Design an enzyme around this catalytic site. Sequence first.
Site, short mmCIF file in Angstrom:
data_model
loop_
_atom_site.label_atom_id
_atom_site.label_comp_id
_atom_site.label_asym_id
_atom_site.label_seq_id
_atom_site.Cartn_x
_atom_site.Cartn_y
_atom_site.Cartn_z
CG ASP B 52 44.57 18.84 55.07
OD1 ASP B 52 43.44 18.56 54.97
OD2 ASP B 52 45.50 19.01 56.02
CG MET B 54 46.20 21.37 60.29
SD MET B 54 46.22 20.16 61.49
CE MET B 54 45.67 18.55 60.92
CD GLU B 369 17.83 61.08 19.11
OE1 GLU B 369 17.75 61.69 20.35
OE2 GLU B 369 17.48 61.63 17.88
#
EC number: 2.7.7.65
Lengths: 454, 454
Positions: B52, B54, B369
């Site tokens: 979270d 917050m 090549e």
Amino acid sequence: SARILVVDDIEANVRLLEAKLTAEYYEVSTAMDGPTALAMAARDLPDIILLDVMMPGMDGFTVCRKLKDDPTTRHIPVVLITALDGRGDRIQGLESGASDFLTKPIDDVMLFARVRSLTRFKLVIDELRQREASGRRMGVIAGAAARLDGLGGRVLIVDDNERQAQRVAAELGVEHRPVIESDPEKAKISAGGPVDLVIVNAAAKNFDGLRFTAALRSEERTRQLPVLAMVDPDDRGRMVKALEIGVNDILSRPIDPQELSARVKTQIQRKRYTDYLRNNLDHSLELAVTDQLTGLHNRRYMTGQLDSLVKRATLGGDPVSALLIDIDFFKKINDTFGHDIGDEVLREFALRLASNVRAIDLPCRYGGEEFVVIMPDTALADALRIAERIRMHVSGSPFTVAHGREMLNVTISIGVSATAGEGDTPEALLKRADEGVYQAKASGRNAVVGKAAH
Amino acid sequence: SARILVVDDIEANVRLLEAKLTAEYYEVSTAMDGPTALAMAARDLPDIILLDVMMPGMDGFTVCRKLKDDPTTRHIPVVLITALDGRGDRIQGLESGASDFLTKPIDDVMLFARVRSLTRFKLVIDELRQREASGRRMGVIAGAAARLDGLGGRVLIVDDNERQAQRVAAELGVEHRPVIESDPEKAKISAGGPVDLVIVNAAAKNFDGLRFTAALRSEERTRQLPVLAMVDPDDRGRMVKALEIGVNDILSRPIDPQELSARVKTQIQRKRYTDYLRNNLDHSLELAVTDQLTGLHNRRYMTGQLDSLVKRATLGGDPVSALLIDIDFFKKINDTFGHDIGDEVLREFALRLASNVRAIDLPCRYGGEEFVVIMPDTALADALRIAERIRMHVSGSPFTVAHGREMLNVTISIGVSATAGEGDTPEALLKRADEGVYQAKASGRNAVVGKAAH
Ligand SMILES: Nc1nc2c(ncn2[C@@H]2O[C@@H]3COP(=O)(O)O[C@H]4[C@@H](O)[C@H](n5cnc6c(=O)[nH]c(N)nc65)O[C@@H]4COP(=O)(O)O[C@H]3[C@H]2O)c(=O)[nH]1
Ligand SMILES: Nc1nc2c(ncn2[C@@H]2O[C@@H]3COP(=O)(O)O[C@H]4[C@@H](O)[C@H](n5cnc6c(=O)[nH]c(N)nc65)O[C@@H]4COP(=O)(O)O[C@H]3[C@H]2O)c(=O)[nH]1
Ligand SMILES: Nc1nc2c(ncn2[C@@H]2O[C@@H]3COP(=O)(O)O[C@H]4[C@@H](O)[C@H](n5cnc6c(=O)[nH]c(N)nc65)O[C@@H]4COP(=O)(O)O[C@H]3[C@H]2O)c(=O)[nH]1
Ligand SMILES: Nc1nc2c(ncn2[C@@H]2O[C@@H]3COP(=O)(O)O[C@H]4[C@@H](O)[C@H](n5cnc6c(=O)[nH]c(N)nc65)O[C@@H]4COP(=O)(O)O[C@H]3[C@H]2O)c(=O)[nH]1
Ligand SMILES: Nc1nc2c(ncn2[C@@H]2O[C@@H]3COP(=O)(O)O[C@H]4[C@@H](O)[C@H](n5cnc6c(=O)[nH]c(N)nc65)O[C@@H]4COP(=O)(O)O[C@H]3[C@H]2O)c(=O)[nH]1
Ligand SMILES: [Mg+2]
Ligand SMILES: [Mg+2]
Ligand SMILES: [Zn+2]
């Protein structure tokens, strides 16, 4: 996800199945009789075939057999749709080549469990077929030993219902090598050893068999391990849950012997094809689990497996046995004959060894010239007898050295041991086997010597 | 299936998430604050972290940043839980290192879509880390060219909603190479080409996006292709379906730039981790899609991709360009200096080539090549300019030949071509480029020459 061919003579059963399957975004074709189905299978090469057993003129058993006679369609999984009381049908279905079964009236959860399972298997069938379409040049002559049946195989039954566990073991015991665990913590250990399939009771009384499956799925050593769950047919959410959690397929109770035989073959074959692909094929370090020259297991791979096996044996339950084989005068063969002759001998030995020991055992290139066989659930007294069996097959027949033109007599010394209780160690087991080989050369080579604790 | 660490300061949000997750058989631990979460992540090494934003004292952004500062936890996917209006949060979440997002109040289908996605990614993250824990010895010194960002990357947008397709393309065009198809049949072909991710509108009007996804999943060329589906969030049955059919993850409409950028990074990064693991690692025939010496793509692999690219271009839509590169006097380098010196030249050139051309282009070892670059969605006028860019980087600096102790001038000749019209072919395209290389040498080498269809 897949192309499905549905076959039934009643144009209504076909529409109902067609509708259910295309609602889940499968590509569905249909056939109302046998000749049509055979023509469409050959033309379309579907991923799986759903086939009703009852049809007039040519029945599903005939169609199934004919699908296996054709080299073009042989590889396609066939599910037979049987009636409610379908014992006779399932037995005949097995001998006619069917991969699995479904019972009318059709259960949607079984239907899709079955299609998803065989679909997943079809991916690996196709991949293996692509490989084989490359050789002709040396059809991997650079590899040998390679078991691709669904048969043999170590099946771990995780169930606290003694009666049922024991019945399932007896059913699988003719074609497989079953093992029972009623303690889920002990089963976690066994399962990281050489196991081909786990069968879990999802309706157990003392543990949650789905919580046990989730556990298997969250650890490296057991993450790819096939799992069949036994479920109660009345508890539908529980069956759905099991499939969401990564159960490969489900077995309704009471357990039908023919369904059991079939789902088990499927999962074991899928595993073996998968493993065979992972290996073979090229080279690498730590990655690597087979020996390039012999096609036996690595030492790396073996010690991993032996760790779990010995750990399980120290918590009570069956012992593990170990063979340490040394080819007699092998260095002297590399000198007086070539190293190319040496390879021929090593390959020939690996072949005879793996032939005369179980698929569930672990024959390994332990070192350059020494080989080891780990044998689960085997007591010392039995391991001595197995060693004598190996000893006779190598000494009883000359080896073919110089590219066909010469014969060569070969003998081996074998040391044998088995685990012993709570203190025992992988290191200690192999040290006992090592002493056994040392004494086998002291007696005069070409012999077997067991060494027990204590 | 996985070990999840949930972090939030409100002991109730934590219990609700814990309950939902363990009901699906995940192993869940919790933390109520930042310092606790950091200590637990380092001690437990969870598979993913739900965090979270917050929290008092130390917020989720800080925690997330600190999780990426610790070399022990850096590798763990972190999902940030934001508020409803979370634009500011998501932007800050991206710069603090978050892998993806979830919006409160939490939608169960999003929750599990997000966990299953990052769990699947975490498998490959751990696998790659195990490899890297082996080297020291030559940290794949035998491999060069290896992009493992989630950035760059060709994103096919399959959508008949012009405005939305075009807006997604704008959001993706800063960090990626987007392509729009409104016709599903044209998109099927495009998707078999060199595509890192498909985004499909599951709520399209003219086609069924789930039917389209299902079809990708039933063909070898597109089976492993990451798919994201755009979904109406009010229609739940439809989101659930998409996830069952094999959509890797889903995007809520209207489409959020930060959510979009995050899931796209996940999918493309998972794909690249996976492809790097399939390659490198050892060797094999028909299997094998990269050149051992240079680490560029095989010719086999390139021609596969080229076929789809040209098929798509002949049905209208943007052209494909082809460069054919030829290192001047390369056989003469093999004679006067050793084949070991030649190898070192081939590696350097490969590295310089790959660096100065897009990751969505296909630089290849075409022969011993000769080299080829195929460029999707590129007109002849641009290919000429790109050929000149490559030509400059190679001749603008000397190569380091003898293990650092001798320097060397090297130039190249390039032939350039582009598709044109309904009649065109891979055969014709490369032939046209080949005439370019012929003529470039006829001018005196160290040059570029384009050949137009006609
Ligand atoms: N891991 C491992 N263990 C081995 C091996 N060979 C023998 N044993 C162990 O020794 C026991 C007795 O073996 P037996 O005398 O041949 O007596 C055997 C044998 O006569 C027969 N049998 C079982 N499986 C096979 C088989 O695959 N081939 C043959 N020819 N006979 C078999 O059944 C009897 C009892 O079998 P079990 O109940 O399994 O009990 C077996 C088994 O536990 C081996 O290669 N690997
Ligand atoms: N004397 C003796 N030899 C053993 C025993 N176990 C394994 N072997 C030897 O090892 C070979 C391969 O065993 P497998 O890999 O399990 O592969 C075996 C196994 O999958 C299956 N099979 C045969 N008989 C039995 C049986 O009685 N029980 C079971 N479960 N499977 C059996 O058929 C396969 C071929 O069998 P074989 O031709 O006999 O070839 C057998 C046999 O020569 C044992 O207990 N006693
Ligand atoms: N770093 C490094 N170590 C080396 C090299 N050559 C040998 N060794 C080490 O020296 C040990 C003995 O080698 P050996 O005299 O050839 O004695 C060898 C040889 O007689 C035989 N052997 C091993 N591999 C092969 C093989 O592929 N073919 C044949 N015919 N015999 C083999 O088995 C014996 C045991 O081999 P190992 O278990 O591998 O144990 C080997 C290995 O650990 C090398 O070039 N580099
Ligand atoms: N497949 C492929 N196509 C190429 C390559 N180089 C150029 N093009 C094509 O030629 C157009 C013009 O390239 P520009 O003149 O450098 O003009 C470019 C350039 O100034 C800039 N640009 C875009 N991507 C990059 C980049 O990765 N690096 C740099 N330095 N500039 C870029 O944006 C302008 C427009 O880019 P586009 O819209 O894509 O339009 C590009 C693109 O379609 C390449 O390596 N591979
Ligand atoms: N002049 C020119 N050169 C081009 C163009 N496309 C590719 N290149 C060259 O190829 C290098 C690698 O491109 P990339 O693999 O896409 O890897 C690129 C790409 O993923 C991304 N990137 C940089 N600029 C842009 C851009 O304008 N648009 C997009 N979509 N991506 C960009 O950053 C990476 C590194 O870019 P560079 O350092 O410039 O290094 C670029 C650049 O030197 C082009 O259109 N014009
Ligand atoms: Mg019928
Ligand atoms: Mg909070
Ligand atoms: Zn003693």
